[PDB]
DNA sequence: ACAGGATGTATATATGTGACACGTGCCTGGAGACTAGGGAGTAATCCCCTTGGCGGTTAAAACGCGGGGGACAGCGCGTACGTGCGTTTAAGCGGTGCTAGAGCTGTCTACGACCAATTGAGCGGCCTCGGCACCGGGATTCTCCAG
């Protein structure tokens, strides 16, 4: 399978978007503290 | 049975239409010099819109299903239309044989065309408000069993 085809390794989703890096850093601490977050977007495609 | 005349018949040759190619002349293009006016070419204005992505809400589609009542084919059958035929009717293919009546040429006006005025339609800009458009019934009037 790996030799047949190659798909993104899901590391670039966060790397290719700076604002997602700070979001990752924030949600990590917020979950370590036991909080629950509500993430709002205007775009629905952005939800994907 | 045959040797030759008495008729046919395609065969080859000189004479009738047509249609292309040629050869003159006379109109219609071509060539040229002016004079706008038209159109190109920016440069400004006024529209009223512009797009992506997305959330919401209502009705117009979109779909399911039953079922009915029509779309098809088969059967049959009885006109009825084509298929010959014998008749006869009249087109038509050439003729003659006039005359309207196109087609033209010329002549000469009334009749357009500018055209510069003159000015009153007519066109846009607002205002107003009856007149259609829709509500709300209330009768009526079809449609469909159902007997």
From Swiss-Prot:
This is Helicase SRCAP. It is found in: Nucleus. The chain holds residues 2026 to 2073 of 3230 of the full protein. Signal peptide: none annotated. It is linked to Floating-Harbor syndrome: A rare genetic disorder characterized by proportionate short stature, delayed bone age, delayed speech development, and typical facial features. The face is triangular with deep-set eyes, long eyelashes, bulbous nose, wide columella, short philtrum, and thin lips. It comes from Homo sapiens (Human). Interacts with CREBBP and EP300. May be part of a complex containing SRCAP, CREBBP, CARM1 and GRIP1. Component of the chromatin-remodeling SRCAP complex composed of at least SRCAP, DMAP1, RUVBL1, RUVBL2, ACTL6A, YEATS4, VPS72, ACTR6 and ZNHIT1. Component of a NuA4-related complex which contains EP400, TRRAP/PAF400, SRCAP, BRD8/SMAP, EPC1, DMAP1/DNMAP1, RUVBL1/TIP49, RUVBL2, actin, ACTL6A/BAF53A, VPS72 and YEATS4/GAS41. (Microbial infection) Interacts with hepatitis C virus (HCV) NS5A. Disulfide bonds: none annotated. Catalytic component of the SRCAP complex which mediates the ATP-dependent exchange of histone H2AZ/H2B dimers for nucleosomal H2A/H2B, leading to transcriptional regulation of selected genes by chromatin remodeling. Acts as a coactivator for CREB-mediated transcription, steroid receptor-mediated transcription, and Notch-mediated transcription.
């Amino acid at each position: 399978c790996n030799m047949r085809t190659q798909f993104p390794d899901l590391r670039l989703i966060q790397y290719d978007c700076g604002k997602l890096q700070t979001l990752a850093v924030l949600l990590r601490q917020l979950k370590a503290e036991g909080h629950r977050v509500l993430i709002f977007t205007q775009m629905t495609r952005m939800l994907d």
